[PDB]
Amino acid sequence: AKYLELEEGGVIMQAFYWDVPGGGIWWDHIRSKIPEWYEAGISAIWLPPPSKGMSGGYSMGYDPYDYFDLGEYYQKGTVETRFGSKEELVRLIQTAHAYGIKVIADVVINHRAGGDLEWNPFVGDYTWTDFSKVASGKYTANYLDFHPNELHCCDEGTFGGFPDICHHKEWDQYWLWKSNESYAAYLRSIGFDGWRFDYVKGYGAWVVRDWLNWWGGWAVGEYWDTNVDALLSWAYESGAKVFDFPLYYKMDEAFDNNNIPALVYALQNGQTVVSRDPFKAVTFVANHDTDIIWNKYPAYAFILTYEGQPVIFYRDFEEWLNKDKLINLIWIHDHLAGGSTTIVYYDNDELIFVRNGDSRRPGLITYINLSPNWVGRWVYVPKFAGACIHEYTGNLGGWVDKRVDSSGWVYLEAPPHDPANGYYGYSVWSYCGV
Ligand SMILES: [Ca+2]
Ligand SMILES: [Zn+2]
Ligand SMILES: [Zn+2]
Ligand SMILES: [Zn+2]
Ligand SMILES: [Zn+2]
Ligand SMILES: [Zn+2]
Ligand SMILES: [Zn+2]
């Protein structure tokens, strides 16, 4: 990482989206992007499930068939996965590490797919639970490894009618994380540093907790719910972070409907993970499963200058949004956005807050404007009294410096929110000369 490292709360890039171009070109494509992302300040990349899926060439990895086939055996109609070959993935990992960029594996262990029809004694009918033909010959399995079985019928949850893995069985524990021949062992052996656990509401937190006890590494769980209490409960029990879906929805409530107050209220009344425990919050503006925020500039300006650990969605960075503004925000996040937060001003369409700084980052002032006009405000920010502050985004159309005299008062300006015309709706300030 050029600036902050992953464990230091550096910015993360979700290096994919739903239905990325197939043909096994993804691993090499992302690898060609490491140099640029390195210079941009990306500290880690989150890659899609790497194992051969039931849908083979069309698989996004969430319907894993042969865990130990990272695109190396002809199976399910293809040698490479939709993303590429095992060597291409390994090479991608190595290139990332050459630049100090960490790699996060998307771990899909709630369900499995592509098994052969097999008569099931616990259901009284045929189920696709026969995984004895796995080309890798590793972690084979049958109905006993899925619900229902002689242990219990069900667990926390299921998904898309796919065989639901029973992590309580020793065979399954051994093959997934409890041994040096385990899936976790394999992923690590090729260089994966951290983990992103898929659909964790489908099984117990004890699974992630033990996985982590064995391998460690940065970890986040996809616990999709709006109840902060449930998310933090799982976070603490598993030992991992959680995606801040609560913040996600509140940002949409605010930024997409001129309702900044809804976000302020949420942040103040612990209605988001980040406002409760910032060390457990992995923030985002969009992911491959959901993308409801249309006013993404104020959104990115917020997760990249506010507390928490931000994730940049590939499609926003490499397709839909102005890359330079995001790169600029990444720089601001790693150099200025530190410390506690103080809300300075807010109304229906404006939000101004101060980051008081930490030992590495001086702090800053974020001014988000959702209105269609240029705005200005006299704000009291004693944190910057006696200093020269500079607007770091360039969103004001030019180089703007201002003196915050001893008084602590300063007139701050923000551009209109009209991204369709190049006005992004936000300005970020901090001491001049950083
Ligand atoms: Ca389950
Ligand atoms: Zn290839
Ligand atoms: Zn079970
Ligand atoms: Zn999910
Ligand atoms: Zn929206
Ligand atoms: Zn790029
Ligand atoms: Zn206003």
Boundaries of every domain in the chain: 1-337, 338-434
Which residues are found with C-beta within 5 Å of the ion, ligand 6? 36
Indicate which ligand has the atom closest to the C-alpha of 167.
3
How many angstroms from the chain centroid is the CA of residue 314? 10
Which CATH fold would you assign to the domain 338-434? Answer: Immunoglobulin-like (2.60.40)
For residue 370, the CA-to-ligand 6 centroid distance in Å is: 27
How many angstroms from the chain centroid is the CA of residue 45? 9
First to last CA, the chain: 19
User: What is the pairing mode between strands 194-197 and 125-130?
Assistant: unpaired
Contact 114, 53 (CB under 8 A): yes
As given in the structure block, the two tokens for residue 40 are 């941009």
As given in the structure block, the two tokens for residue 427 are 């300005």
**CA triplet 273, 297, 381: central angle to 5 degrees?**
70
What is the biggest distance separating any 2 CA atoms in the chain, rounded to whole angstroms? 80
Indicate which ligand has the atom closest to the C-alpha of 71.
2
For residue 166, the CA-to-ligand 3 centroid distance in Å is: 3
Method: X-ray
Resolution of the structure in the document, Å:
2.2
Q: To the nearest 10°, report the CA torsion of 48, 53, 56, 60.
A: -30
d(CA 44, CA 3) in angstroms, rounded, equals 11
Which CATH fold would you assign to the domain 1-337? Answer: TIM Barrel (3.20.20)
For residue 229, the CA-to-ligand 1 centroid distance in Å is: 21
User: For residue 143, how many other CB atoms are within 10 A of its CB?
Assistant: 22
Residue type, 68: F
Is there a common fold for 1-337 and 338-434?
A: no
3-state SS record for the chain: CCCCCHHHCCCEEECCCCCCCCCCCHHHHHHHHHHHHHHHCCCEEEECCCCEECCHHHCCCCCEEECCCCCCCCECCECCCCCCCHHHHHHHHHHHHHCCCEEEEEECCCECCCCEEEEECCCCEEEEEECCCCCCCCCCCCHHHECCCCCCCCCCCCCCCCCEECCCCHHHHHHHCCCCCCHHHHHHHCCCCEEEECCHHHCCHHHHHHHHHHHCCCEEECCCCCCHHHHHHHHHHHCCEEECHHHHHHHHHHHCCCCHHHHHHHHHCCCCHHHHCCCCEEEECCCCCCCCCCCHHHHHHHHHHCCCEEEEEHHHHHHHCCHHHHHHHHHHHHHCCCCCEEEEEECCCEEEEEECCCCCCCCEEEEEECCCCCEEEEEECHHHCCEEEEECCCCCCCCCEEEECCCCEEEEEECCEEHHHCEECEEEEEECCC
Contact 19, 315 (CB under 8 A): no
For residue 224, the CA-to-ligand 4 centroid distance in Å is: 7
d(CA 268, CA 329) in angstroms, rounded, equals 24
